């Protein structure tokens, strides 16, 4: 019956996703590292 | 000409850094949250 998995936009090509993967991983790792640091500032500040 | 005040982009994936640009920043906020969780996993969690 229901057959709806709504494909919208994001990254149109996986090849472009490859190109972006360094800057993607870097920015997310920055955010994770920052989160760990923020975790520390919530307890020891 | 480039010696002129231009509203210039010319990015790799024109679609990605429109349709997913807010969601990208949202997932960084998500990653910071995840960072806090792995931060507590390191200590008391």
mmCIF file of N, CA and C in Angstrom:
data_model
loop_
_atom_site.group_PDB
_atom_site.id
_atom_site.type_symbol
_atom_site.label_atom_id
_atom_site.label_comp_id
_atom_site.label_asym_id
_atom_site.label_seq_id
_atom_site.Cartn_x
_atom_site.Cartn_y
_atom_site.Cartn_z
ATOM 1 N N UNK A 1 0.854 -1.194 0.000
ATOM 2 C CA UNK A 1 0.000 0.000 0.000
ATOM 3 C C UNK A 1 0.894 1.249 0.000
ATOM 4 N N UNK A 2 1.250 1.788 1.172
ATOM 5 C CA UNK A 2 2.151 2.956 1.304
ATOM 6 C C UNK A 2 3.525 2.648 0.704
ATOM 7 N N UNK A 3 3.972 3.545 -0.175
ATOM 8 C CA UNK A 3 5.267 3.414 -0.873
ATOM 9 C C UNK A 3 6.065 4.745 -0.940
ATOM 10 N N UNK A 4 6.079 5.450 0.185
ATOM 11 C CA UNK A 4 6.618 6.827 0.241
ATOM 12 C C UNK A 4 7.869 6.946 1.119
ATOM 13 N N UNK A 5 9.010 6.988 0.416
ATOM 14 C CA UNK A 5 10.309 7.386 1.007
ATOM 15 C C UNK A 5 10.782 8.640 0.244
ATOM 16 N N UNK A 6 10.393 9.777 0.810
ATOM 17 C CA UNK A 6 10.566 11.120 0.207
ATOM 18 C C UNK A 6 12.017 11.566 0.011
ATOM 19 N N UNK A 7 12.501 11.348 -1.202
ATOM 20 C CA UNK A 7 13.833 11.815 -1.641
ATOM 21 C C UNK A 7 13.742 13.293 -2.061
ATOM 22 N N UNK A 8 14.481 14.116 -1.326
ATOM 23 C CA UNK A 8 14.365 15.588 -1.400
ATOM 24 C C UNK A 8 15.486 16.314 -2.163
ATOM 25 N N UNK A 9 16.683 16.326 -1.593
ATOM 26 C CA UNK A 9 17.836 17.038 -2.182
ATOM 27 C C UNK A 9 19.158 16.534 -1.583
ATOM 28 N N UNK A 10 19.635 17.277 -0.586
ATOM 29 C CA UNK A 10 20.923 16.987 0.094
ATOM 30 C C UNK A 10 22.084 17.011 -0.910
ATOM 31 N N UNK A 11 22.709 15.845 -1.035
ATOM 32 C CA UNK A 11 23.785 15.624 -2.013
ATOM 33 C C UNK A 11 23.272 14.765 -3.173
ATOM 34 N N UNK A 12 23.122 15.419 -4.315
ATOM 35 C CA UNK A 12 22.628 14.774 -5.552
ATOM 36 C C UNK A 12 23.545 13.667 -6.103
ATOM 37 N N UNK A 13 24.852 13.903 -6.039
ATOM 38 C CA UNK A 13 25.862 12.915 -6.489
ATOM 39 C C UNK A 13 26.818 12.476 -5.370
ATOM 40 N N UNK A 14 26.968 11.152 -5.300
ATOM 41 C CA UNK A 14 27.958 10.485 -4.434
ATOM 42 C C UNK A 14 29.427 10.844 -4.753
ATOM 43 N N UNK A 15 29.701 11.181 -6.013
ATOM 44 C CA UNK A 15 31.019 11.686 -6.440
ATOM 45 C C UNK A 15 31.356 13.047 -5.798
ATOM 46 N N UNK A 16 30.376 13.953 -5.828
ATOM 47 C CA UNK A 16 30.456 15.223 -5.076
ATOM 48 C C UNK A 16 30.597 15.023 -3.554
ATOM 49 N N UNK A 17 29.867 14.044 -3.025
ATOM 50 C CA UNK A 17 30.002 13.627 -1.617
ATOM 51 C C UNK A 17 31.437 13.175 -1.285
ATOM 52 N N UNK A 18 32.074 12.426 -2.179
ATOM 53 C CA UNK A 18 33.507 12.070 -2.068
ATOM 54 C C UNK A 18 34.406 13.312 -1.945
ATOM 55 N N UNK A 19 34.217 14.246 -2.878
ATOM 56 C CA UNK A 19 34.922 15.558 -2.919
ATOM 57 C C UNK A 19 34.802 16.311 -1.587
ATOM 58 N N UNK A 20 33.588 16.360 -1.053
ATOM 59 C CA UNK A 20 33.267 17.034 0.223
ATOM 60 C C UNK A 20 33.661 16.282 1.499
ATOM 61 N N UNK A 21 33.846 14.961 1.432
ATOM 62 C CA UNK A 21 34.151 14.123 2.607
ATOM 63 C C UNK A 21 35.281 14.588 3.547
ATOM 64 N N UNK A 22 36.420 15.112 3.054
ATOM 65 C CA UNK A 22 37.449 15.723 3.917
ATOM 66 C C UNK A 22 36.900 16.871 4.772
ATOM 67 N N UNK A 23 36.318 17.887 4.133
ATOM 68 C CA UNK A 23 35.732 19.059 4.828
ATOM 69 C C UNK A 23 34.516 18.717 5.707
ATOM 70 N N UNK A 24 33.709 17.767 5.257
ATOM 71 C CA UNK A 24 32.618 17.165 6.060
ATOM 72 C C UNK A 24 33.140 16.540 7.355
ATOM 73 N N UNK A 25 34.004 15.538 7.218
ATOM 74 C CA UNK A 25 34.646 14.845 8.352
ATOM 75 C C UNK A 25 35.380 15.798 9.309
ATOM 76 N N UNK A 26 36.146 16.723 8.741
ATOM 77 C CA UNK A 26 36.873 17.751 9.512
ATOM 78 C C UNK A 26 35.931 18.594 10.377
ATOM 79 N N UNK A 27 34.899 19.179 9.758
ATOM 80 C CA UNK A 27 33.924 20.033 10.459
ATOM 81 C C UNK A 27 33.109 19.286 11.528
ATOM 82 N N UNK A 28 32.665 18.061 11.215
ATOM 83 C CA UNK A 28 32.008 17.180 12.196
ATOM 84 C C UNK A 28 32.911 16.732 13.355
ATOM 85 N N UNK A 29 34.149 16.362 13.053
ATOM 86 C CA UNK A 29 35.166 16.038 14.083
ATOM 87 C C UNK A 29 35.471 17.234 14.998
ATOM 88 N N UNK A 30 35.575 18.425 14.398
ATOM 89 C CA UNK A 30 35.668 19.706 15.132
ATOM 90 C C UNK A 30 34.508 19.885 16.118
ATOM 91 N N UNK A 31 33.282 19.691 15.615
ATOM 92 C CA UNK A 31 32.043 19.735 16.421
ATOM 93 C C UNK A 31 31.997 18.700 17.567
ATOM 94 N N UNK A 32 32.394 17.458 17.282
ATOM 95 C CA UNK A 32 32.510 16.383 18.296
ATOM 96 C C UNK A 32 33.548 16.742 19.382
ATOM 97 N N UNK A 33 34.748 17.134 18.951
ATOM 98 C CA UNK A 33 35.838 17.573 19.851
ATOM 99 C C UNK A 33 35.413 18.764 20.740
ATOM 100 N N UNK A 34 34.791 19.746 20.090
ATOM 101 C CA UNK A 34 34.174 20.906 20.760
ATOM 102 C C UNK A 34 33.108 20.479 21.778
ATOM 103 N N UNK A 35 32.257 19.527 21.402
ATOM 104 C CA UNK A 35 31.247 18.924 22.299
ATOM 105 C C UNK A 35 31.840 18.294 23.570
ATOM 106 N N UNK A 36 32.924 17.538 23.406
ATOM 107 C CA UNK A 36 33.703 16.956 24.523
ATOM 108 C C UNK A 36 34.220 18.072 25.461
ATOM 109 N N UNK A 37 34.787 19.113 24.849
ATOM 110 C CA UNK A 37 35.247 20.338 25.540
ATOM 111 C C UNK A 37 34.113 21.071 26.287
ATOM 112 N N UNK A 38 32.971 21.238 25.617
ATOM 113 C CA UNK A 38 31.731 21.798 26.202
ATOM 114 C C UNK A 38 31.236 20.954 27.394
ATOM 115 N N UNK A 39 31.295 19.632 27.234
ATOM 116 C CA UNK A 39 31.065 18.651 28.325
ATOM 117 C C UNK A 39 31.940 18.944 29.549
ATOM 118 N N UNK A 40 33.237 19.165 29.313
ATOM 119 C CA UNK A 40 34.157 19.617 30.367
ATOM 120 C C UNK A 40 33.783 20.958 30.999
ATOM 121 N N UNK A 41 33.433 21.960 30.184
ATOM 122 C CA UNK A 41 32.982 23.278 30.684
ATOM 123 C C UNK A 41 31.667 23.283 31.478
ATOM 124 N N UNK A 42 30.808 22.295 31.226
ATOM 125 C CA UNK A 42 29.604 22.028 32.035
ATOM 126 C C UNK A 42 29.875 21.491 33.456
ATOM 127 N N UNK A 43 31.044 20.868 33.650
ATOM 128 C CA UNK A 43 31.467 20.271 34.945
ATOM 129 C C UNK A 43 32.641 20.990 35.641
ATOM 130 N N UNK A 44 33.642 21.387 34.856
ATOM 131 C CA UNK A 44 34.877 22.082 35.313
ATOM 132 C C UNK A 44 35.095 23.355 34.496
ATOM 133 N N UNK A 45 34.680 24.470 35.097
ATOM 134 C CA UNK A 45 34.697 25.797 34.469
ATOM 135 C C UNK A 45 34.996 26.856 35.528
ATOM 136 N N UNK B 1 34.445 40.613 -15.502
ATOM 137 C CA UNK B 1 35.752 41.016 -14.942
ATOM 138 C C UNK B 1 35.711 40.759 -13.426
ATOM 139 N N UNK B 2 36.850 40.477 -12.793
ATOM 140 C CA UNK B 2 36.897 40.286 -11.331
ATOM 141 C C UNK B 2 37.272 41.556 -10.540
ATOM 142 N N UNK B 3 38.069 42.442 -11.142
ATOM 143 C CA UNK B 3 38.235 43.821 -10.650
ATOM 144 C C UNK B 3 36.955 44.643 -10.925
ATOM 145 N N UNK B 4 36.021 44.353 -10.032
ATOM 146 C CA UNK B 4 34.632 44.876 -9.930
ATOM 147 C C UNK B 4 33.965 44.147 -8.752
ATOM 148 N N UNK B 5 33.041 44.837 -8.095
ATOM 149 C CA UNK B 5 32.353 44.320 -6.889
ATOM 150 C C UNK B 5 31.252 43.323 -7.309
ATOM 151 N N UNK B 6 31.576 42.050 -7.130
ATOM 152 C CA UNK B 6 30.740 40.930 -7.625
ATOM 153 C C UNK B 6 30.074 40.126 -6.503
ATOM 154 N N UNK B 7 28.821 39.763 -6.766
ATOM 155 C CA UNK B 7 28.093 38.768 -5.969
ATOM 156 C C UNK B 7 28.410 37.397 -6.600
ATOM 157 N N UNK B 8 29.591 36.896 -6.261
ATOM 158 C CA UNK B 8 30.182 35.730 -6.944
ATOM 159 C C UNK B 8 30.276 34.498 -6.023
ATOM 160 N N UNK B 9 29.820 33.381 -6.583
ATOM 161 C CA UNK B 9 29.902 32.052 -5.957
ATOM 162 C C UNK B 9 30.774 31.126 -6.816
ATOM 163 N N UNK B 10 30.073 30.381 -7.674
ATOM 164 C CA UNK B 10 30.692 29.374 -8.568
ATOM 165 C C UNK B 10 31.264 28.155 -7.826
ATOM 166 N N UNK B 11 30.494 27.683 -6.847
ATOM 167 C CA UNK B 11 30.802 26.489 -6.020
ATOM 168 C C UNK B 11 30.665 25.180 -6.816
ATOM 169 N N UNK B 12 31.327 24.140 -6.301
ATOM 170 C CA UNK B 12 31.304 22.786 -6.881
ATOM 171 C C UNK B 12 29.898 22.192 -7.092
ATOM 172 N N UNK B 13 29.151 22.023 -6.003
ATOM 173 C CA UNK B 13 27.768 21.486 -6.028
ATOM 174 C C UNK B 13 26.779 22.572 -5.588
ATOM 175 N N UNK B 14 26.143 23.142 -6.605
ATOM 176 C CA UNK B 14 25.232 24.305 -6.457
ATOM 177 C C UNK B 14 23.985 24.004 -5.616
ATOM 178 N N UNK B 15 23.447 22.807 -5.834
ATOM 179 C CA UNK B 15 22.292 22.222 -5.130
ATOM 180 C C UNK B 15 22.546 21.917 -3.643
ATOM 181 N N UNK B 16 23.663 21.243 -3.350
ATOM 182 C CA UNK B 16 24.025 20.825 -1.975
ATOM 183 C C UNK B 16 24.054 21.997 -0.981
ATOM 184 N N UNK B 17 24.873 23.002 -1.302
ATOM 185 C CA UNK B 17 25.012 24.231 -0.480
ATOM 186 C C UNK B 17 23.908 25.292 -0.689
ATOM 187 N N UNK B 18 22.729 24.766 -0.997
ATOM 188 C CA UNK B 18 21.431 25.448 -0.918
ATOM 189 C C UNK B 18 20.478 24.577 -0.078
ATOM 190 N N UNK B 19 20.053 23.472 -0.688
ATOM 191 C CA UNK B 19 19.032 22.553 -0.136
ATOM 192 C C UNK B 19 19.389 21.891 1.211
ATOM 193 N N UNK B 20 20.677 21.663 1.439
ATOM 194 C CA UNK B 20 21.150 21.003 2.670
ATOM 195 C C UNK B 20 21.938 21.903 3.630
ATOM 196 N N UNK B 21 22.204 23.152 3.247
ATOM 197 C CA UNK B 21 23.026 24.089 4.040
ATOM 198 C C UNK B 21 22.539 24.311 5.496
ATOM 199 N N UNK B 22 21.237 24.498 5.782
ATOM 200 C CA UNK B 22 20.725 24.547 7.161
ATOM 201 C C UNK B 22 20.883 23.217 7.923
ATOM 202 N N UNK B 23 20.489 22.115 7.292
ATOM 203 C CA UNK B 23 20.646 20.741 7.830
ATOM 204 C C UNK B 23 22.094 20.363 8.165
ATOM 205 N N UNK B 24 23.030 20.847 7.356
ATOM 206 C CA UNK B 24 24.479 20.697 7.597
ATOM 207 C C UNK B 24 24.871 21.270 8.969
ATOM 208 N N UNK B 25 24.545 22.547 9.181
ATOM 209 C CA UNK B 25 24.752 23.254 10.462
ATOM 210 C C UNK B 25 24.012 22.607 11.647
ATOM 211 N N UNK B 26 22.787 22.156 11.396
ATOM 212 C CA UNK B 26 21.990 21.365 12.356
ATOM 213 C C UNK B 26 22.688 20.078 12.822
ATOM 214 N N UNK B 27 23.292 19.349 11.882
ATOM 215 C CA UNK B 27 24.073 18.125 12.199
ATOM 216 C C UNK B 27 25.379 18.406 12.961
ATOM 217 N N UNK B 28 25.973 19.577 12.771
ATOM 218 C CA UNK B 28 27.076 20.054 13.642
ATOM 219 C C UNK B 28 26.661 20.238 15.105
ATOM 220 N N UNK B 29 25.499 20.857 15.310
ATOM 221 C CA UNK B 29 24.860 20.983 16.652
ATOM 222 C C UNK B 29 24.602 19.610 17.300
ATOM 223 N N UNK B 30 24.066 18.699 16.481
ATOM 224 C CA UNK B 30 23.914 17.264 16.791
ATOM 225 C C UNK B 30 25.241 16.608 17.236
ATOM 226 N N UNK B 31 26.294 16.808 16.438
ATOM 227 C CA UNK B 31 27.658 16.316 16.715
ATOM 228 C C UNK B 31 28.265 16.871 18.017
ATOM 229 N N UNK B 32 28.007 18.140 18.330
ATOM 230 C CA UNK B 32 28.363 18.756 19.622
ATOM 231 C C UNK B 32 27.669 18.040 20.805
ATOM 232 N N UNK B 33 26.370 17.761 20.643
ATOM 233 C CA UNK B 33 25.587 16.950 21.606
ATOM 234 C C UNK B 33 26.195 15.551 21.836
ATOM 235 N N UNK B 34 26.499 14.877 20.728
ATOM 236 C CA UNK B 34 27.229 13.589 20.709
ATOM 237 C C UNK B 34 28.609 13.667 21.404
ATOM 238 N N UNK B 35 29.316 14.764 21.157
ATOM 239 C CA UNK B 35 30.585 15.120 21.817
ATOM 240 C C UNK B 35 30.467 15.154 23.345
ATOM 241 N N UNK B 36 29.414 15.810 23.845
ATOM 242 C CA UNK B 36 29.082 15.840 25.289
ATOM 243 C C UNK B 36 28.842 14.417 25.846
ATOM 244 N N UNK B 37 28.130 13.588 25.088
ATOM 245 C CA UNK B 37 27.880 12.179 25.471
ATOM 246 C C UNK B 37 29.155 11.320 25.544
ATOM 247 N N UNK B 38 29.989 11.347 24.503
ATOM 248 C CA UNK B 38 31.306 10.662 24.549
ATOM 249 C C UNK B 38 32.233 11.262 25.641
ATOM 250 N N UNK B 39 32.108 12.564 25.858
ATOM 251 C CA UNK B 39 32.734 13.294 26.985
ATOM 252 C C UNK B 39 32.379 12.693 28.360
ATOM 253 N N UNK B 40 31.091 12.486 28.611
ATOM 254 C CA UNK B 40 30.657 11.765 29.831
ATOM 255 C C UNK B 40 31.032 10.274 29.844
ATOM 256 N N UNK B 41 31.040 9.604 28.688
ATOM 257 C CA UNK B 41 31.530 8.209 28.583
ATOM 258 C C UNK B 41 32.980 8.024 29.076
ATOM 259 N N UNK B 42 33.791 9.054 28.837
ATOM 260 C CA UNK B 42 35.160 9.194 29.353
ATOM 261 C C UNK B 42 35.296 9.347 30.874
ATOM 262 N N UNK B 43 34.237 9.842 31.521
ATOM 263 C CA UNK B 43 34.262 10.218 32.959
ATOM 264 C C UNK B 43 33.295 9.378 33.831
ATOM 265 N N UNK B 44 32.024 9.745 33.796
ATOM 266 C CA UNK B 44 30.906 9.071 34.502
ATOM 267 C C UNK B 44 29.611 9.200 33.685
ATOM 268 N N UNK B 45 29.214 8.070 33.108
ATOM 269 C CA UNK B 45 28.131 8.020 32.114
ATOM 270 C C UNK B 45 27.341 6.703 32.122
#
